[PDB]
Swiss-Prot record:
Disulfide-linked positions: C3-C24, C6-C11, C17-C45, C49-C60, C61-C66
UniProt tissue specificity: Expressed by the venom gland.
Name of protein: Gamma-bungarotoxin
Taxonomic lineage of the native organism: Eukaryota, Metazoa, Chordata, Craniata, Vertebrata
Major place of residence: secreted
Length: 68
């Protein structure tokens, strides 16, 4: 599989995903901690997505680098 999972909000580069998983994933939530951005759209590779319960905005993708 291949699913880019950067920390910024615009990583068009490519990033294959290891492990026996197979997908792209992202979760976004607003939260003012220090000086970061607003909606933290963290990302990662998995079967469908992280263990989010959808309370967080999950965004997965069944294809090569998708969720930038």
């Amino acid at each position: 599989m291949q699913c880019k999972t950067c920390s910024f909000y615009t990583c068009p580069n490519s990033e294959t995903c290891p492990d026996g998983k197979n997908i792209c994933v992202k979760r976004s939530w607003t939260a003012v901690r220090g000086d970061g951005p607003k909606r933290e759209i963290r990302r990662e590779c998995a079967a469908t997505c992280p263990p989010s319960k959808l309370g967080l905005t999950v965004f997965c993708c069944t294809t090569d680098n998708c969720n930038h």
